[PDB]
Each structure stands twice: as structure tokens, then as C-alpha cells.
């Protein structure tokens, strides 16, 4: 059904506010989102907002600490700019603190039909996503004076990382052994670890940030992994790996692996691979590793003396 927003300018700020929008094929007027928390969410934002395909007004997302991906707007494909936010914006992401995925542009064809784009703060969100949107959404081609800032966007985010290939994928009915390529940052001690992700996933349409929010709902069975014992010889860097345990027979897992790397940025991530088997505290750990790196670097700087 069509949803004329009687207030014209609806905010969604919790699950119970979105349920007003259940079954909205299109939304007249603008939307703001400020979704900031939730529990055992059961994808309840996706269900209410998934149907929406066309938004007449602008789309504003602000302060929205819980949301990590905007893929809950499963069918969203058109912002019309028939009511621009001041500054003539049609999309406006301000201070989304855990927003990591704007949209899966491979499967998303959203066109913000009129007015500019806006992106400020959103540290987790990558400039790559932002640039993809402005070209997917016509704005940059349409010479929209998009207000996206290099500073404060993509900061504190492992964006634009290298690809990891999987080299080895050996299964059993209940365990899978993987090895991916060796990856090392320019300084190998910046590899604090890898982190595998896996998800029993019957369909090959999975996305990294799907089913995920920063309020602690997470569909991925993340498995952090110690760094491998490095070789001096680069041609003797063994392919690191993990034997992920406790699987179910003849079930297709979506899997990827990603580097855990201390900022000096330098990191890598695999694609999602599908394998059918067979029929904060974190800042303390990122400091501790950075501290032992610091000491070691100090010791070297002190013990090794250049002869005059």
C-alpha cells in the first residue's frame, strides 16, 4: 500500500516506530532515521522497511548508533527529492557511528532523483561506499555539489583493504579446513590477528553486513585467529589457516576472513566463499599489541647504534 506520511516527515527511532510503516510499498514525504538501540532484533527493521521502494522526500539518517547496514531497506530504489532537506539534500547521513555499509551497490540501484548528497562523520562508513552511491544515484553525474568530507569519513575504519584469496578449502561433514593467502602489512607486527567469519547460508546472496547491527545482533559466527609465526623468507610464508569446528552435514556455509590490524588502514578481506561441507575491550587489546610493538621498536632504536 502507499504510505502518505500524515506528518510528512516521519522519524523512525525504534522497532516500534517503524511498525507504522509495515507494508509501505512507497513512502510519500521524507524520512529521518535515528535508530539508536534494540534487543534480539530479529531483523524487525528489515521487515517493516523492506517493502519501501520509493521515498518522495529526502532520506536523513542521523545519530543512528545501532544501524550498521542500510540493507534493511531491501527494496528501496528511488528517492525523489520532492521535499529536500535544507541544503537541497536528498540523502543525509550525519554521525551514523556504526554505519559500515551504505548499501550493497552490486544488488542495489537506488537513484536519489533530485538534490545533493550529504555525508559527514559516519566514521565506519567508507568513502568508497559513498562514492559508489553518488554515481549509482546519479548525483555526481548530475553535477550535484555533493557535500561529503574526506576528513571524518572512513576514519577509524579498515576501508579499501586488499583482497585475500582462499587457497585451500577441505571439508568434512562437521569441520572445514581453510587456508587463505599469506597476508602481511608493511610491518608484520601490525597483523594482530585474522578474523574468520562464517554463517550457515543456504543462498549465495549473502552480504558482509546483512543481518547485523551494532546493538549486538550478529548472524556471523566470528572466529578471531592468532597471527602466524612469520618466516624470514617470503617464499616460505606458509598459507595460514583454521579448522572451523562443529558444523552440520550437507549445509552450505557462507565464509570470509579478514585481517585484524593495528592503525599506524593496512588490512585485507576475503570475498564471501560458499562451502557445502560434506554429505571498549578491543581498544585495550589493540593498545597492548601496539605497546609491545612500541617497546620492541624502542629497544631496537636503543640497542643498535650506527657507527659514526
Amino acid at each position: 500500500k502507499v504510505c502518505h506520511l500524515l506528518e510528512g516527515e516521519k522519524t523512525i527511532d525504534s522497532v516500534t516506530s517503524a511498525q507504522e510503516l509495515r507494508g509501505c510499498t512507497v513512502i510519500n514525504g521524507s524520512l529521518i532515521i535515528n535508530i539508536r538501540g534494540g534487543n534480539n532484533l530479529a531483523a524487525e527493521l528489515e521487515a517493516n522497511l523492506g517493502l519501501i521502494e520509493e521515498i518522495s522526500g529526502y532520506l536523513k539518517i542521523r545519530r543512528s548508533y545501532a544501524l550498521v547496514s542500510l540493507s534493511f531497506f531491501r527494496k528501496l530504489r528511488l528517492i525523489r527529492g520532492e521535499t529536500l532537506e535544507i541544503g537541497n539534500y536528498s540523502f543525509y547521513a550525519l554521525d551514523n557511528q556504526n554505519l559500515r555499509q551504505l548499501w550493497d551497490w552490486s544488488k542495489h540501484n537506488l537513484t536519489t532523483t533530485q538534490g545533493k548528497l550529504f555525508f559527514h562523520y559516519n566514521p565506519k562508513l567508507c568513502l568508497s561506499e559513498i562514492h559508489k552511491m553518488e554515481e549509482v544515484s546519479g548525483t555526481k553525474g548530475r553535477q550535484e555539489r555533493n557535500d561529503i568530507a574526506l576528513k571524518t569519513n572512513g576514519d577509524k575504519a579498515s576501508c579499501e583493504n586488499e583482497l585475500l584469496k582462499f587457497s585451500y578449502i577441505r571439508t568434512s561433514f562437521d569441520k572445514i579446513l581453510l587456508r587463505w593467502e599469506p597476508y602481511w602489512p608493511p610491518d608484520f607486527r601490525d597483523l594482530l590477528g585474522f578474523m574468520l567469519f562464517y554463517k550457515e547460508a543456504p543462498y549465495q546472496n549473502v552480504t558482509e553486513f546483512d543481518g547485523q547491527d551494532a546493538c549486538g545482533s550478529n548472524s556471523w559466527t566470528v572466529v578471531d585467529i592468532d597471527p602466524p609465526l612469520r618466516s624470514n623468507d617470503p617464499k616460505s610464508q606458509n598459507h595460514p589457516g583454521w579448522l572451523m569446528r562443529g558444523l552440520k552435514p550437507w549445509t552450505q556455509y557462507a565464509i570470509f576472513v579478514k585481517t585484524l590490524v593495528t592503525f599506524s588502514t593496512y588490512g585485507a578481506k576475503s570475498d564471501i566463499i560458499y562451502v557445502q561441507t560434506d554429505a571498549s575491550q578491543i581498544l585495550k587489546e589493540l593498545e597492548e599489541s601496539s605497546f609491545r610493538k612500541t617497546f620492541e621498536d624502542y629497544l631496537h632504536n636503543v640497542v643498535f647504534v650506527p657507527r659514526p
Binding site: 610491518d187 621498536d297 631496537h300 632504536n301 636503543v302 643498535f304 647504534v305 650506527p306 657507527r307
Partner: peptide, 21 residues
């Protein structure tokens, strides 16, 4: 220092050699 020379940049073999008797 060595960590600026060899770790946060690339040491030539001359530069590594500079640290030895």
C-alpha cells in the same frame, strides 16, 4: 634510529651494514 631507517622505511644493505663493527 634503526626503526626509522629499516622498519618504517627500506634499509639498503649499506644501511644495515652501518650498524656493525
Amino acid at each position: 634510529g634503526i626503526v626509522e631507517q629499516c622498519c618504517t622505511s627500506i634499509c639498503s644493505l649499506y644501511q644495515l651494514e652501518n650498524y656493525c663493527n
